[PDB]
């Protein structure tokens, strides 16, 4: 991707995280576990449904359209009718295919951007009381219990208290 | 036959709410738009990289 997070420095997905698109996996003395991030997933869902609804709305319903008849001395008008029908069909086929092809790439870049933003948000919080390992992973220097974990996954991690 | 429909082509009735079809350019009723495509799938999720 353009942002280098999905299939980048984080090289795989989690099949054990079932309730969201992006999230955390933690590990301390109490135990382990996954947990989704709700704000990022909610924003992404809003954006994606908006995009799908706009795509649906820009194409209007097609009403009754049946062919005509001509005799042996009206070949020019028959050819003009065929020309018009074929041209409009070709134009709309091109439009639909191009729209889908171009929207798919932007949709795939959106999720990469969201994952990168989440990683940076956590990294600026921990700054000094944690070591960056490389796979999207942080190893604490002090002892981080469940209150510490839940404060990290909230944005209100208190840097001075843990030096 | 003896059935009901809202969109009819010279080949059968259509039973969808999708925006596109590739059955027949001639339609009667309230019908989707005709294109010559064979595949139009839109993505909503992310890249699938399991097992890791």
């Amino acid at each position, epitope marked *: 991707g353009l942002f280098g997070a999905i299939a980048g420095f984080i090289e795989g997905g989690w099949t054990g995280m079932i309730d969201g698109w992006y999230g955390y996996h933690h590990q301390n003395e109490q135990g382990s576990g996954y947990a989704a991030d709700q704000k990022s997933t909610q924003n992404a*869902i809003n954006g994606i449904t908006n995009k799908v*609804n706009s795509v649906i709305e820009k194409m209007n319903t097609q009403f009754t359209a049946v062919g005509k008849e001509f005799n042996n001395l009206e070949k020019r008008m028959e050819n003009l009718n065929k020309k018009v029908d074929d041209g409009f069909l070709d134009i709309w086929t091109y439009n639909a295919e191009l729209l889908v092809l171009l929207e798919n790439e932007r949709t795939l870049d959106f999720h990469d951007s969201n994952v990168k933003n989440l990683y940076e948000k956590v990294k600026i919080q921990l700054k000094n009381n944690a070591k960056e390992i490389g796979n999207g992973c942080f190893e604490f220097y002090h002892k981080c219990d469940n209150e510490c974990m839940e404060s990290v996954r909230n944005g209100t991690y208190d840097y001075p208290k843990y030096s | 036959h003896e059935c009901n429909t809202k969109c009819q082509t010279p080949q059968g009735a259509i039973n969808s709410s999708l925006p596109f079809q590739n059955i027949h350019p001639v339609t009667i009723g309230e019908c989707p738009k005709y294109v010559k495509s064979a595949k139009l799938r839109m993505v909503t999720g992310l890249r699938n990289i399991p097992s890791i």
Partner: antibody, heavy 119, light 109 residues
Framework: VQLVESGAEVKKPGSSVKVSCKAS????????ISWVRQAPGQGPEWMGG????????KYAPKFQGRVTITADDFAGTVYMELSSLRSEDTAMYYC??????????????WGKGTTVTVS | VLTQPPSVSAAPGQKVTISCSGS????????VSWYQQLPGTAPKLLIY???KRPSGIPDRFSGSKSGTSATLGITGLQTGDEANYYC????????????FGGGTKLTVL
């Protein structure tokens, strides 16, 4: 948004029933949808709900083997099917919004109601 | 299971409180929401996230939670408050599911 259920139905025991719910706005939604039951003279009862994109469905432990909830997405409709009707499945059925994409305890928009009688 | 006082009786202009009590399984580790159902209509959300209010709800309604029990307070009572009030919380241990209260008949003089 506005939620509109289907009409009122009367059946006899041993059969099944299928109610529907239609929401205004764009066909695709970013909130979960739940079904609530209320018998005459008692408090409401949560039956089950559905999630917008992941497609997960949740049911109450009482209504485990009978209820089935489905969606249409492109139409904007949600369907609920209840099987093996007893004489106690005679109540008012409501369709409820949820706010977010998860089936939490906060339903902020309700429909109007639909009576299903069994006899 | 959430248990509430079945009935409440007070005079106009007074302040009343209804208590939703539960257990450590449901009430102790989640939020509580409040619904008010007039006779003949669908329920309506009053309080969510244990002390919050939607748009269009007066300041006369409020609520809080204390350990393993919540309370809803209405001050400035009038005749248009004749209804049933329900408390709800998202239970989660064996199989998570929404749980509703029993009911409360706030009677006004």
């Amino acid at each position: 948004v506005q939620l509109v259920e289907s009409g009122a139905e009367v059946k006899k025991p041993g059969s099944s029933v299928k109610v529907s719910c239609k929401a205004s706005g764009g066909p695709f939604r970013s909130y979960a949808i739940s079904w609530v039951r209320q018998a005459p003279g008692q408090g409401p009862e949560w039956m089950g709900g559905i999630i917008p994109i992941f497609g997960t469905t949740k049911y109450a432990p009482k209504f485990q083997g009978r209820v089935t909830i489905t969606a249409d997405d492109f139409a904007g409709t949600v369907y609920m099917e209840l099987s093996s009707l007893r004489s106690e499945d005679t109540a008012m059925y409501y369709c409820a919004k949820h706010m977010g994409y998860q089936v939490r305890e906060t339903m902020d928009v309700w429909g109007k109601g639909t009576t299903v009688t069994v006899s | 299971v959430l248990t509430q006082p079945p009935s409440v009786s007070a005079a106009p202009g007074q302040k009343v409180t209804i208590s939703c009590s539960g257990s450590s399984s449901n009430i102790g580790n989640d939020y509580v929401s409040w619904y008010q159902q007039l006779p003949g209509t669908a329920p309506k959300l009053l309080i969510y996230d244990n002390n919050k209010r939607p748009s269009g709800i007066p300041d006369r309604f409020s609520g809080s939670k204390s350990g393993t029990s919540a309370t809803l307070g209405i001050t400035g009572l009038q005749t248009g408050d004749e209804a049933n009030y329900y408390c709800a919380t998202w239970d989660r241990r064996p199989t998570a599911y929404v749980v509703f209260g029993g009911g409360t008949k706030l009677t006004v003089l």
